[PDB]
Write a protein that binds this ligand. Structure first.
Ligand SMILES: C=CC(=O)Nc1cc(Nc2nccc(-c3cn(C)c4ccccc34)n2)c(OC)cc1N(C)CCN(C)C
Length: 283
């Protein structure tokens, strides 16, 4: 299947950087505005500022789904820059932490559906993410999230065999054999749902990563979050089945959470309950 995606090259003059959003091992992500040349539009963007950034560019350019991050372009300056759609509410892990008290069952179950859709689309592009986690989901709006961080992503050959790596989100086989598949991604989807259902708890809080492999071998798993009916917890547990072919398919995860999302309070129990254009409109 020849990959005929287009990689757009951007001139630096086409965009203003307005303020820093975060820094470190990553470089520094600014937020800004992209004004395409002779276009009377203005697109809000994240601008992340060598081989590693290009591999990510490659993967990101080759994807196109409403629940997976839009790569707008790259700029080839002294320092390379990835330009992507600005996701104004930030990473979902922090979002659930900083709004624990005003998140409803509807949002939770929808996020679950959307993350599955993003992942199923990646399964469709023979693409394995290898780093799904609440931290790597961005929030465009509370109604709409997208999967991100393709720094570990790999194209496909029914598995991938690697040479730190984020241990507590990892499938057993991956910990022990560095084998990664779409079913490895499902295990990670499991933990991601757990993060969301506990409003951003750290999994195996205060437990060394070394001892993780053995813990899972023995049979232990993440506890049932208080808001979760057994119906929902059962889905998490199925995602953590030692035998990868026993775990659900993203496809089926979309369906189960969809069903739950039509009667959210049965499945989750929570006391309470000018020339600007967004990138999704810029084709
Ligand atoms: C993990 C922190 C985070 O996401 N902060 C954040 C992000 C955005 N928007 C945004 N949009 C697209 C990509 C990114 C982004 C991607 N990466 C890798 C980042 C690293 C650090 C900071 C931001 C990013 N960020 C944003 O848009 C206005 C605002 C914020 N924060 C100021 C609000 C979140 N605050 C509650 C931490």
């Amino acid at each position: 299947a020849p990959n005929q995606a287009l990689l757009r090259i951007l001139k630096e003059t086409e965009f203003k950087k307005i303020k820093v959003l975060g820094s470190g091992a990553f470089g520094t992500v600014y937020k800004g505005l992209w004004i395409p040349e002779g276009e009377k539009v203005k697109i809000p963007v994240a601008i992340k500022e060598n081989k590693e950034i290009l591999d990510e560019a490659y993967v990101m350019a080759s994807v196109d789904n409403p629940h997976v991050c839009r790569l707008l372009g790259i700029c080839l300056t002294s320092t390379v820059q990835l330009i992507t759609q600005l996701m104004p509410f930030g990473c979902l892990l922090d979002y659930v932490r900083e709004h624990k008290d005003n998140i409803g069952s509807q949002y939770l179950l929808n996020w679950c559906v959307q993350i599955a859709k993003g992942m199923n689309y990646l399964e469709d592009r023979r693409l394995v993410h290898r780093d799904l986690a609440a931290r790597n989901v961005l929030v465009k709006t509370p109604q709409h999230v997208k999967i991100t961080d393709f720094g570990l992503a790999k194209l496909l050959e029914k598995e991938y065999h690697a040479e730190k790596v984020p241990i507590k989100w990892m499938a057993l086989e991956s910990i022990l054999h560095r084998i990664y598949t779409h079913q490895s991604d499902v295990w990670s989807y499991g933990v991601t749902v757990w993060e969301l259902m506990t409003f951003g708890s750290k999994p195996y809080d205060g437990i060394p990563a070394s001892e993780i492999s053995s813990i899972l071998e023995k049979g232990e798993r993440l506890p049932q979050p208080p808001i979760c009916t057994i119906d929902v917890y059962m889905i998490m547990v199925k995602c953590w089945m030692i035998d990868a072919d026993s775990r659900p398919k993203f496809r089926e995860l979309i369906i189960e959470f969809s069903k739950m999302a039509r009667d959210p309070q049965r499945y989750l129990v929570i006391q309470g309950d000018d020339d600007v254009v967004d990138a999704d409109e810029y084709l």
